[PDB]
Symmetry: C3
Subunit: 424 residues, 3 copies
């Protein structure tokens, strides 16, 4: 009977067993004498290997998936009803992401543990990288060294510049139409290969996460503050999800559609419960189809377009979670983030929540993308993974609720056009 439960989710059960084993081994080694830091380095080495493996692939993913999605997936044959959905998604997700950054900088869960103008000028300068091979590992930083300001070259990937340039590249390829089909197919092949590599690497994730946990449990001064930091991080994420799902999305539905959002929740309550249970938008998709069709009575076309694409492109709770987690790792490491990196994380949270289900088994890769877009030490992911089992259900329910409200909004903004088409 146990096999029928564990085997069907072998990767998840392996990761859970690895986390438990790493935590208990870390506790046992903590019960021992203060360990030689080289022995800790050997212990936490497979985690370093996993982090390096994933950070090796964070580059080809942003090179290829942006091009493939912008060129290939974006088809305007859906007409205005398509755009009314798309402009919704990239609008609500940011509202989520910024909200997280507002909350985590207000609560500062881990905090107890250059001017802003130059920071924003540096943000804009790194957003247009004057070189493209040097934007793969180097950003430009303004240094006042002591009144003549200059621009030196930092070390760290320039995620924003590459993302901007390849968004432009994908848009141009899409505008070429069919004459660029050869390169569209080439980059689609590269994307499939890189996703195969990500899946292949993530099978090694159990042992890497186990070693990361066993290397972080040993090297903390006292658990009495780390446990409180993690608890406040959970509190921040849950408060953000509540504020987004229960106050912001109903406010959008009220201001745009001007229909009672509480009736909408009464309709999609079954979908929300099924999203909490399944913890997957794709699995919950039939339930939300049934709810929005037979309960709210919205048009079949608007649902049939919005829901299948909103379940993979519109995830709000994941964006808020990733923003809060990146800022929490920044604060817990003592790294205070300026106004040029807060916007960087608040944009990479969006651009990594877009691809957190469009690319299977890429949550860790997206978290590392966010943590390396702001130059942070990417070794504290272990604390996130040790707790990223209760938040997943809530942040999936928030995504499903966001998709439902997107379907409602798009239907209410295109009812006249659909009626006119159906009349003929």
């Amino acid at each position: 009977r146990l096999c029928d439960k564990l085997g069907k989710n072998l990767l998840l059960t392996l990761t859970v067993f690895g986390v438990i084993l790493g935590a208990v081994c870390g506790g046992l080694l903590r019960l021992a004498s203060p360990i030689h830091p080289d022995v800790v380095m050997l212990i936490a080495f497979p985690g370093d290997i996993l982090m390096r493996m994933l950070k090796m692939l964070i580059l080809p993913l942003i090179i290829s998936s942006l091009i493939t999605g912008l060129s290939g997936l974006d088809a305007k044959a859906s007409g205005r009803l398509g755009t009314r959905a798309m402009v919704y998604y990239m609008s609500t997700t940011i509202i989520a992401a910024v909200l997280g950054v507002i909350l985590v900088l207000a609560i500062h869960p881990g905090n107890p543990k250059v001017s802003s103008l130059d920071a924003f000028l540096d943000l804009i300068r790194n957003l247009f990288p004057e070189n493209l091979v040097q934007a793969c590992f180097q950003q430009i930083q303004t240094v006042t060294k002591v009144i003549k300001k200059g621009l030196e070259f930092k070390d760290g990937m320039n995620v924003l510049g590459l993302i901007g340039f390849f968004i432009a590249f994908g848009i141009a390829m899409g505008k070429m139409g069919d004459q660029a089909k050869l390169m569209v197919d080439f980059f689609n092949i590269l994307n499939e290969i890189v996703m195969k590599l990500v899946i292949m690497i993530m099978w090694y994730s159990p042992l890497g996460i186990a070693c990361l946990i066993c290397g972080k449990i040993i090297a903390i001064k006292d658990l009495e503050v780390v446990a409180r930091q993690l608890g406040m991080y959970m509190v921040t994420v849950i408060i953000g999800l509540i504020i987004h799902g229960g106050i912001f999305l109903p406010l959008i539905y009220f201001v745009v559609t001007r229909k009672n959002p509480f009736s909408f929740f009464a309709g999609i309550f079954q979908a929300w419960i099924t999203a909490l249970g399944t913890a997957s938008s794709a699995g919950t998709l039939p339930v939300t189809f049934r709810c929005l069709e037979e309960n709210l009575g919205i048009d079949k076309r608007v649902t049939r377009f919005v829901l299948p694409v909103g379940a993979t492109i519109n995830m709000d709770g994941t964006a808020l979670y990733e923003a809060v987690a990146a800022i929490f790792i920044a604060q817990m490491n003592g790294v205070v983030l300026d106004g040029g990196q807060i916007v960087t994380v608040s944009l990479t949270a969006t651009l990594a929540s877009v691809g957190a289900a469009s690319i299977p088994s890429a949550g860790l890769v997206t978290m590392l993308l966010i943590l390396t877009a702001v130059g942070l030490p990417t070794e504290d992911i272990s604390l996130l993974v040790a707790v990223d089992w209760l938040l997943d259900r809530m942040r999936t329910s928030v995504n499903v609720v966001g998709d439902s409200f997107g379907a409602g909004i798009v239907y209410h903004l295109s009812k006249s056009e659909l009626d006119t088409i159906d009349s003929q």
Copy 2:
């Protein structure tokens, strides 16, 4: 009646209005107190963004346009005659570029404002870059540090190494014939995407150039010396164009063809006037067709090949202009150029005059390619653009004259072969 003039050339009129607005705003701010240099940095920021965009695009252009041109365009179905044109172009253009580099180093318009052996060895070393990913942003510089000479890695793109390697790459691809079509098409698609990006960016050029002008007017010591420097630069370009069009090209026609070049000039006078009026070789191409066909009576085939390809590959006046302008920017900044960078600019001027009309709206990109091949500060282009409205007509006229003399030379070097073919 005004829209019939401004509307047709919307980009040109936008750039002119931007330049005028930037100049008048700079004058007004100059009438104010010495401004905080940070306020100047904010003022001159959109120009910085434009230069960063263009310098971002200078890499894929030399990666892809060289491949597309050498592999795709070069087809020897034209036979010996085709070579008799090509070896002409890449010769006379150089005769232009070097000439400019001489004149600007004899007049030194902006000057008042390591041994050469090691410099040439450094030129040859950077011509064969031992690494290709490190040649995208780093050149090798010889340092005597104090008798044991060594080689360190400077900062700045290695334009010569990339150009040489990809000339070899394109030549090999062309020698593969049809078996390499699947990558010829890939690089052609990439070239079209990059050209679309250049056009898209150059629509932002008005605001960037306006801000560059308004940030350069404020931050100069006195307008007198700058105006004199610009006047001397324009005089140098005029002298170079006169010496090339009126003395060098007739000398080539005399030494090779041994026919009176003044009769040729009398014949192509109409084409020269129409080139001055139109300021475009492509628009003057029908006029030079008619002139060279019904006035000089050269063969139809030699004209039909040379002129359509010479109007886009053979521009000598543009090469002389670009060499003189790059050296003038070097002299204004006080950057004295050694014998390893003078050859660099005198080669990049040729390789940019080749692609200054094969790629629409890529003149600024070519100027930045030349200014970054020799490690110069790319912020003085505004001074060039302030005066680059009277030199355009004259350099276009010189290009058209060069194409006409190339047609004459090629016809006189293939009359026997054409006669033998026509006899059968």
Copy 3:
């Protein structure tokens, strides 16, 4: 009668004449006064150009040949009999490689002329490069700077990380099947282009090698130690070949097949002699086919598969030679190699003995790949080429013997399957 000998091998005779001319000119200049080191730098400059050319081409070769071989060449239509061969090759070659590294570090031909744990951890870190554009020119090195260990970015190509990533990439390409054809063809075309470039550059090899030889002869202290160093290096290579082809391969045949290996030698004696005479596995291939078929009586299928692919993938003597030569250059320069670079050279020798005949005229490129994978000065190759005319015959003989024993081993490990197939 002389042209019938020199003309057929024009590249080989050109290289020999260049070596002789460079050596005699170096001797004559040695008879002169101590020369200005700048004159020596000028003399040894074409050799520097050749080294830079080849080191420029070592990157696209490992980018493209790995993909082309792992994806394209590896076809499992040969069934298990294929794997029984392949697992043999990559296991014999390593034995050939490591053995060389054992002898050269034991004999240290040129020697008279960070802990190991951190070295191996640095090996593993450089084998998983956290960045893929920074892995093209930079490795990570552990520095104890003075108890808090850190990781700083060294300078030098990260050959191992790129090889590992692109082995993974090619394996994924091959596993994804026929949907990757549009990119397999792209990389095959790129590989053929780069092979054409390697052949084109290697035609310039005579003059570069002559200048390298002259520059080395001019700039060494005394021949009394250099001649002894080269003699000991040749003795080490010969000892390694004798041990591998006389003690190790017969031991493998005895332990696996349990048949008298001396009878196997008696069977392939003609093949061994023809391999020594021809100094080429491909030319000897008909002779070893005839010997193994009509003398040992092994199955036609096993021979017809193993020999044609073993002649181009299984060269053991070349791996031993390259490992010994790289370590000999390391010792002769006074560069002591740690345990993290000994494994690097012992793996790059294996991965460059595969591509030492799969890519014609790429022996120098493979030697430079090995010498730059361990951060060595690539100017001592001339002293290898001065003696690399007697060792070629012996290493070719060892390669042919290895292929013959591979055929024997694979036949004895698949006799039952072949008999069962033939019975039906």
